[PDB]
Design a protein around this ligand. Structure first.
Ligand SMILES: CN1CN([C@@H]2O[C@H](COP(=O)(O)OP(=O)(O)OP(=O)(O)O)[C@@H](O)[C@H]2O)c2nc(N)[nH]c(=O)c21
Ligand code: NA
Ligand SMILES: [Zn+2]
Ligand SMILES: [Zn+2]
Lengths: 289, 120
């Protein structure tokens, strides 16, 4: 029954622990036996991520804005962006970025370090697949990583609309304490592992319905240790069952209200709408990235 | 391996790809195949995957020789008919999506590939 799901979300029992940080006993690289012939790993992975995102209270405005970081592959193509374009409503603004050049189906493609990416407009959904390979160095010390993660925390705090959502890739060694802490500023959050890449320590930290203020106090060092503990004690068998039925794949057109409200107008009833994915708070100005 | 540079540094990139294939070269790889129902309209270039039982759907820009080679498109304004869209390619020709788009034409009335799906 778990095999049919697009993947596995970290159970609340594991989130509520206060585990010490241990090494993860899972290996990322591996001959992937469940990816169908001719399908790239990233197409299968992003497919299952969107299938999982379809179960959440995502706000889906009429003119949705989505930014995708780490969109380019070593092959020079953007398979994750291709899946996002397939999933998102037609005409959704989809902008993608990466340090090196690549070919993409996004409306705009930004080349260079993510820190160089600047916009004055707010976004409704942020997807990230960025990974620290140059530094990497698994070794023994597993401290909080800076680099793109520091920019990403600032980006979510300054440019994510209230009601908006995120899905940010992490691994045993590629993670950040402030990112986990920021997960507590959302209506709900999870660490989601795709069934096609279940042998890897990779997961997507998904934050549903951004509230712009803490709802829970999360310690990032501790929550990463909780995440590792769940992965070490709960092996997940590789599965691509969910890829064999794409009939309900597109993101449902909700026509979610977009309003530009002042802080003094954001009250309990407005927070309740944000938490149900029934509202997005931001301006509706022309987007310049 | 060097097929992209081979075509990019040719006066006629489409002819270079054809000559490269005629000499035994492997077709351009890493064309993004999508997962889909295979119950679509069957049309050649669509807003979302529209493959029928006899086709595969691919991300448009990955099947474009000019996008892949990072060179000018033959269009007057420089636009691309594939980028940002999905291209349906017959399963028998899915081994070479870039070559298929270069060698084929879309029917202006039914929207299907001439000689493959076009019934007109
Ligand atoms: C997917 N969610 C979940 N969620 C919140 O968590 C509670 C339990 O939901 P859970 O996923 O655990 O499922 P269920 O209710 O069946 O319970 P159980 O699995 O038995 O624990 C739920 O009441 C919510 O407030 C939430 N919140 C916003 N905002 N958005 C989401 O998409 C989700
Ligand atoms: Na909302
Ligand atoms: Zn092109
Ligand atoms: Zn015709």
């Amino acid at each position: 029954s778990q095999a049919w799901q697009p993947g596995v979300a970290m159970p609340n029992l594991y989130k509520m622990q206060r585990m010490l940080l241990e090494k993860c006993d899972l290996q990322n690289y591996g001959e992937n036996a469940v990816i169908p012939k001719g399908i790239m790993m990233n197409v299968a992975k992003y497919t299952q991520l969107c299938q999982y995102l379809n179960t959440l209270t995502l706000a889906v405005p009429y003119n949705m804005r989505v930014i995708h970081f780490g969109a380019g592959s070593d092959k020079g193509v953007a398979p994750g962006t291709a899946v996002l374009r397939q999933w998102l409503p037609t005409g959704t603004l989809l902008v993608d970025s990466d340090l090196n050049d690549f070919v993409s189906d996004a409306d705009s493609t930004l080349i260079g370090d993510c820190a160089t990416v600047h916009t004055a407009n707010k976004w409704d959904l942020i997807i990230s697949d960025m990974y620290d390979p140059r530094t990497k160095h698994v070794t023994k010390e597993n401290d909080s990583k800076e680099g793109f993660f520091t920019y990403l925390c600032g980006f979510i705090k300054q440019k994510l609309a209230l009601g908006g959502s995120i899905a940010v890739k992490i691994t045993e060694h590629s993670w950040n304490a402030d990112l986990y802490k920021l997960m507590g500023h959302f209506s709900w959050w999870t660490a989601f592992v795709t069934n096609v890449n279940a042998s890897s320590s990779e997961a997507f930290l998904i934050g549903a319905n951004y509230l712009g203020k803490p709802k829970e106090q999360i310690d990032g060092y501790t929550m990463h240790a909780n995440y590792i503990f769940w992965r070490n004690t709960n092996p997940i068998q590789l599965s691509s069952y969910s890829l064999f039925d794409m009939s309900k794949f597109p993101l449902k057109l909700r026509g979610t209200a977009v309003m530009s409200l002042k802080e003094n107008q954001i009250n309990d009833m407005i927070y309740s709408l944000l938490e149900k994915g029934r509202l997005i708070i931001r301006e509706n100005n022309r987007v310049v990235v | 391996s060097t097929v992209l540079s081979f075509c990019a540094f040719a006066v006629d990139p489409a002819k270079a790809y054809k000559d490269y294939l005629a000499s035994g070269g492997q077709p351009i790889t890493n064309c993004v195949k999508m997962l889909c129902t295979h119950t679509g309209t069957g049309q050649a270039i669509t807003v979302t995957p529209e493959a029928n039982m006899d086709q595969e759907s691919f991300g448009g820009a990955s099947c474009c020789l000019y996008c892949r080679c990072h060179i000018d498109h033959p269009n007057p304004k420089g636009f691309c008919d594939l980028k940002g869209k999905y291209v349906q390619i017959p399963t028998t020709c899915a081994n070479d999506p870039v070559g298929f788009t270069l060698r084929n034409t879309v029917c202006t009335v039914c929207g299907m590939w001439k000689g493959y799906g076009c019934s007109c």
